[PDB]
Design a protein around this ligand. Sequence first.
Ligand code: ATP
Ligand code: ATP
Ligand code: MG
Ligand code: MG
Lengths: 239, 413, 391, 889, 50
Amino acid sequence: SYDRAITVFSPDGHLFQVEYAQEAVKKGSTAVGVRGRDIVVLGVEKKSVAKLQDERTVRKICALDDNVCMAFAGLTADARIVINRARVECQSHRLTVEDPVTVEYITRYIASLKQRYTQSNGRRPFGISALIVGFDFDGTPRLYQTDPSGTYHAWKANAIGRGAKSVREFLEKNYTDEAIETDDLTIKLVIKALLEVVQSGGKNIELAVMRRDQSLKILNPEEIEKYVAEIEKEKEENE
Amino acid sequence: PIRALDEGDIALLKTYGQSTYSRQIKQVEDDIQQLLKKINELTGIKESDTGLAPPALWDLAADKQTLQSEQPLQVARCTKIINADSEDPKYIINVKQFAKFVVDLSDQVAPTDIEEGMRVGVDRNKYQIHIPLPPKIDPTVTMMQVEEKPDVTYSDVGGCKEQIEKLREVVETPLLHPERFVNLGIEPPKGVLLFGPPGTGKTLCARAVANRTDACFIRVIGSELVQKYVGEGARMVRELFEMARTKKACLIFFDEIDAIGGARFDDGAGGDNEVQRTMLELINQLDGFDPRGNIKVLMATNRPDTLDPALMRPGRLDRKIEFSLPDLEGRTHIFKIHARSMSVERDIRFELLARLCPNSTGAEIRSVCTEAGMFAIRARRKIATEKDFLEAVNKVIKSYAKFSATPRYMTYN
Amino acid sequence: PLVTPHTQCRLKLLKLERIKDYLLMEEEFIRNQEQMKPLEEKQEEERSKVDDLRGTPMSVGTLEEIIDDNHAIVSTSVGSEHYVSILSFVDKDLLEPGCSVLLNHKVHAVIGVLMDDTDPLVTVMKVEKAPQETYADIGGLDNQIQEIKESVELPLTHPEYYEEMGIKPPKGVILYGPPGTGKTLLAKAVANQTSATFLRVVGSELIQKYLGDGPKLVRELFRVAEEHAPSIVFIDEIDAIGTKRYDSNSGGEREIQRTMLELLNQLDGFDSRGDVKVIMATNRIETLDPALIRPGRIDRKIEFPLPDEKTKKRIFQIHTSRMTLADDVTLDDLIMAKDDLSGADIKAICTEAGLMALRERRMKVTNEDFKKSKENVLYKKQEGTPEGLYL
Amino acid sequence: MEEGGRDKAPVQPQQSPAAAPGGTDEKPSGKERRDAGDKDKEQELSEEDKQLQDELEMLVERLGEKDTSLYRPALEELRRQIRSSTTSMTSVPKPLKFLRPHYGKLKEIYENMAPGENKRFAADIISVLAMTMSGERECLKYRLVGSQEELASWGHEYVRHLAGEVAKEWQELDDAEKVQREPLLTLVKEIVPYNMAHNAEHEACDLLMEIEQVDMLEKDIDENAYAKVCLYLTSCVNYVPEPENSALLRCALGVFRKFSRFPEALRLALMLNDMELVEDIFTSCKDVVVQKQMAFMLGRHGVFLELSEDVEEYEDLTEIMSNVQLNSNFLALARELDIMEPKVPDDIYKTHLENNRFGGSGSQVDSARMNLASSFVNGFVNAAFGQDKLLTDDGNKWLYKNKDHGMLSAAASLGMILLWDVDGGLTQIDKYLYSSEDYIKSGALLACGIVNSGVRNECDPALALLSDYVLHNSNTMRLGSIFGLGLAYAGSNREDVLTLLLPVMGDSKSSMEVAGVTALACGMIAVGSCNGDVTSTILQTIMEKSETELKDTYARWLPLGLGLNHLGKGEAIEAILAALEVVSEPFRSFANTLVDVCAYAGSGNVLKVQQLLHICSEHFDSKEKEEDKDKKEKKDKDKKEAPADMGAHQGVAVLGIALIAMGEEIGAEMALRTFGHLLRYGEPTLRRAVPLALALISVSNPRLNILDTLSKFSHDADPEVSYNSIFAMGMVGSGTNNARLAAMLRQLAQYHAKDPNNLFMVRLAQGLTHLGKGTLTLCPYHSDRQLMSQVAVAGLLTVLVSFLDVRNIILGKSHYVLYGLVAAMQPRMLVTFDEELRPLPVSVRVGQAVDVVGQAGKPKTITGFQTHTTPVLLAHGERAELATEEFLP
Amino acid sequence: RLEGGSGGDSEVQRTMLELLNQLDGFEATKNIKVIMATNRIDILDSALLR
Ligand SMILES: Nc1ncnc2c1ncn2[C@@H]1O[C@H](COP(=O)(O)OP(=O)(O)OP(=O)(O)O)[C@@H](O)[C@H]1O
Ligand SMILES: Nc1ncnc2c1ncn2[C@@H]1O[C@H](COP(=O)(O)OP(=O)(O)OP(=O)(O)O)[C@@H](O)[C@H]1O
Ligand SMILES: [Mg+2]
Ligand SMILES: [Mg+2]
């Protein structure tokens, strides 16, 4: 049971050290994200503040360019490097080619950076998994994800973190064939999906939206408190 | 700020809350469990049988022809004989539970049939040989020399036909054609051990040619050679190898030889408590009395640790036939075996199943076929579908075996 | 088992007094039964003399082989073997090799055959009382409850389904998982609601030291299970009787190993098992002999994990049913903050929170007693986590 | 244990009531105002029921008990205010002041004067102040008053209204499960005058709630499952008006006051039958109230619905009488040829195919009495429209071959072939009728009464079988003609044909078996009135049975129709009637136990069950009255089959132990007919307890006693896997258990479990628990099997067609008016919920799910979903009406 | 609980399992209270610590 090198194949053909990095993702905070008609949205599960520290330095959602977003899991040491690297590449692309950076180009860079970083010994792979959301490529909303093996991949709705399997099974019974228009309805989908949190405290949610033309809009814990109230109010009417 | 409870403070708890039905419901439940007891010693129904006979036929038996069996008849014991002497008996005999004795024969016998290793009738006081008795023939051999047709078809162990072809060449070809051996100038091999993974076809390939022998066949329990009493198992393995060499064209199948095995030519063999009594006597009688025999013996075990190189020195055992896993076509044959005899659909394909069974035994293949039927019982069904088997393979193989983490897959399509 | 108010109500006063009425009458009917029997017997001449023809201190022996000429070969308890006569009133059909007989002292002759009676060691291991409550007692385990009911209760109650497809029922079931999950509960609940003879064997009951007492009991235990019902044999913690088969030449491990081997043999004896079901239960599965775990012997392996945040709601529903719950509590909060406490953890919380109300002199239980019970009970094992490392 | 320093209340209320004798005299203020400061503070330190520990209530009375003994009596000049301050303050701790002889002295502080409105300081507190103490009053103090002196003093007068407001207070404070504490209070107070307590509690419950009725509503009937005679007489009529007056659920009238029909008054439920004809709105609940009124618990209602509204509101009667009977035929016509069944399975006989290779060869059985059982391969399987032209050729040959009693039997099988039929049933008989033989026509025309059984329309009240009866100068024409028409009109209580067939009894033509089944025929008809039947029977009894000491043809048939004429009333006047009427020799006082307990069908009257044991228990009885202890055990079998399994566990506990495992001719001849009478669902406790005594045949006795216990071991309906037991015992029953005697019997048992696929409900339990007799058709056969010689000649009249009250099977049909709906029904293992958290889950076996005509089974309260409201009667009963409504989005 | 005997103890394992099964086996016995006292908390087995 040799699991102590990254360049060795198992006799049934596996790379267990690549496989062990994805177990480190499952100890991370959950984050979901859907794409809408025009407005995309993503939400995170924020852990409890320990009463004696500032909370503007626990940032889990960042923007690479002015029109693309980012949510991750895993461990924050390896996450900070990939964020700081991808801010350079989406900026250096704009210099070499005068367009803004598409959402598909920047995920190939992050995946290829995690790709070549797997192959050599003495390079412990990045134990994070990212979600890249942006309605950037000419009015078209897209969201992708990454993987510690280095495989970028496109979904229409997503969940990561601890117990994402419950959320992914939840969305398939919830994400209707009705494309949820009236974008507060789409936000009400995510807040209801994150209302099936591991704990669902109600005051522990940070959602971030983008109306495809503005900048990033972090919601406030009075507007987000309004949407939690109407979810319980409309659920009481169903009985 | 801890306070404990004073005696008046106990009475606050014990009073409040249904003070009309509290003991009223309780002592009724209390004394009824007392009454469950008091029925049981009052009943005490138990009675004996003691195995008597109806008095139509034993009343005349219960006459003086019981006392004629009391006082004239005797209470003689049985023993074994080590050896003898010439012109004068001086016989050496073990009770072996009491001591070993040097005794005489009594006057009622002739000194001819008091040969070695024989049950004899022994006096309680003078220990003389009263009557020679048979070795209790024959439940010590024929109760496992069953000479009965077993219900295993030749088409049951299909898929491992070349391992069958090895065993069909070793066993069948000297027993029915020792003629090409003369036409070529050779002699057949006379030793094969079987080992490998459990549930592979070991007992099957044994019993299939035990069905196709039309002859004597012996299956041997591995723990039967292990005995409670010291010096008893060797005496048994004496009696097995003697009375099996008598008749012709017989087969003996040893099985689970882990208990009687271990390398005795190598570092161990520091045992010698009734396991080696069986072991040293069998390797004694395996050679010595077998040049150019007629009865083939096969061993089978799950542990390849217990190989004896003295057995594997030629003369005793020659060939290492082990069993393997089916490639695909052996597996697809086996799925057809365990599903032809049950209520299935006429349209399922089995090659899709053996793709999903990379490293598996027919024991597991049988377990899937039973489990897939169990899913049909969960709903109201009477015939199995394709997905019934598909859930079963997921339930058996993709759950406890060597593959996990199915959702994180996304690297291979 | 119909005490269904479960509270201080006059129905249970009426129900139990009905039960008192039928047991007192069944006492008084059998009391009149041994009363009003004027018999005053006189024994038959044949029976009275044979009772004096036999010895008064009769001894128990064992058949080994039979010669039909009214004398055969038997064995004593010590194994001394005797060419004794057999008397011609013994009902000469029950003579099979292995049957127990009665002997004399003078000529040691076979007085009469004994019926197939066993030692007191195995008769303790036969259950007399249905222990505890039914499947409503457990707090939601129904994925696995429906498994064992298919393997045990369904083939006994309704074996029509299996012959409709020609499928034999499974034979052995292993229950495993982390401790405190309910392995012993499901054994007790099946033994409650059954019509089978339920045998209770616990592990190291079965190991003794007289050089043959180990493998003798396995033959006796499954003889009893064969002669009696379609039966359930529950052996608990078989990890104390099975692990990976080492064979040191010292005569301490062999008595384990010979017994270990013959149980696996007597399991697949295949002579006539006659629907004897075997339930086995340990905590760890990894330290087992793989010869036991393989199919052909045992067909079902069942995990009992640390459940979820959903069936916890049912266990807190059950273990708080018989107590005056105050209306300030939100028991979901305790399920919310934690992920890996077990059913035995929940029952300890429910007892401790009740003790805290007695300390501050109450009957109803506030939210604060559950807060203090959670802090007091849980913090003894929780050690080792990388906080700050992840997020 | 750091006490002291904060003990305020163990000091100042230790001193100020100790200074109350120091300040009663010469201190008019401190007598009053320290009493008022004591009273409200002791009141305030009890109202929170999160401090059961009270810093005065077990602190003050250490001296305060000797104080109040010298403060309340010894004052002797008690003012109008100081008694309202003393007794309000000192009647509170007295359950805890005093020990268990408080029960005589809950009054020596309180009932000096009850101060005003004692709930004024006891309103918000549940029971800690005085409500437990109030129950302590009504337990011991009121019962000794109300033992013979109910109409009495203040211990009844104010105690009436005291228990009135207390019983309101249980449904006032929290409205918790203390609702059921009110029947706990109402029934301990004035146990026998429960209705006098309940009359105030009826009207109080009428204005109490209309949502908090239903669990107390089922609380009463759960207490009405079993009680004393007069209590079950009392609270069942208290049960009646609550869905009549408070609510109008009211579709629980017909069956759930058939509960109250026989105990209280037969006309009272006829007044409730009049209360059915009051609330005639509109049709749907009216439809299903009257669905059960024909063939679910009684017939005989076809005389009261031909009044002035004969258009559709009173033209439901004949629709109830025979048309929905024929729509029930359309179940077995349409729906059950759909689910399983072509006209002849005929192959349970063929299921004995594998036997011929079991042990060499076969074709060794040629017994002619097996050909009796050969009638039932055609006989039992052809119930519910198994009509057979030329599949009765096995009958038609053996009818015309030999076996006169089998000629009658195969002719009697044709009525079971066309069962519940009036359309063309007699036309099937007429072609097989005219053979001009005694045995053929007496079997066929008896089977005609089976054909129109349950119809009770105009078929032949005196047309066919009265003309068949007046043919008599001879054999079974004399016998078989009276039986089928009394079998047909068993559900009615008509007087005319009872008086037509009373000169059968009055003929004194001394055919003994004819007069015996005459008592059986009239017994099936009436259960109530016409004491002249009891006169007419005992006339020929004293004429005949006095001048003999012989066979039970006298005993098994003649006193039975008496008890069938007096079934089901625990009044114990019918025992005073009958047993003092037949005061006679003990072989005629065999009849003493019959009409005693035939009036005792089902209740809790355990005092009768001990005289059912203690008088004739064993006595060792050298072959004189051994029939009487069997029949005394026979009556132990009922009064056990409907306390709803409360005594059925006790019954199998007793009769397995001290009977067959501790008994004689009582056990090992007869005591297995309990299990053929207690249940017939089948469960492997008793179904395997019988082959404990059957595989051991115990052949030393006349083994057909134990092979009688073979036969009605398969008296369990609802077909099962029990074939393993029967076919294996038939294999050992071919050679051994000789085929001369029971080769009919084993295959009679074998072919009875699979009678049809369906139609197994013969077990006297409809809706939930009511009888629907029923018993009058079954109980003749288990009385008939005592024991032998009716296996050959006489019992063949009985054993084929004894019990013929099978009512239909299944609660799948919908009947919404066009009968097109199916449902979404959801079958489960039956209810356990008695009082738990609201709302209560009705059942537990959610897995099986059907839509339409699926099966009944033993423990099935099948429910439905999908907002169809199922509003009809909310119990069940297999002709649901099912309206439609969905006003909940 | 260690593994089977090469360096395994495997005999006081049997004795411990009976302590673990004679106080929480098939029968919850009554009026019996045990007091166990030791240091070295992290090394005693986590099945009699439940
Ligand atoms: N190669 C195979 N072909 C067909 N059936 C097989 C094969 N292998 C296993 N089986 C199935 O498994 C069972 C045979 O197992 P087998 O008798 O070989 O076990 P075993 O080798 O005796 O095990 P152990 O060595 O542990 O005692 C049969 O019932 C059969 O259904
Ligand atoms: N799922 C559950 N629902 C209700 N009670 C539970 C549950 N799980 C555990 N308990 C409680 O825990 C107690 C012990 O459970 P049990 O001993 O059966 O678990 P176990 O797996 O057998 O543990 P061990 O193997 O250590 O004996 C039971 O008495 C029961 O009250
Ligand atoms: Mg094998
Ligand atoms: Mg346990």
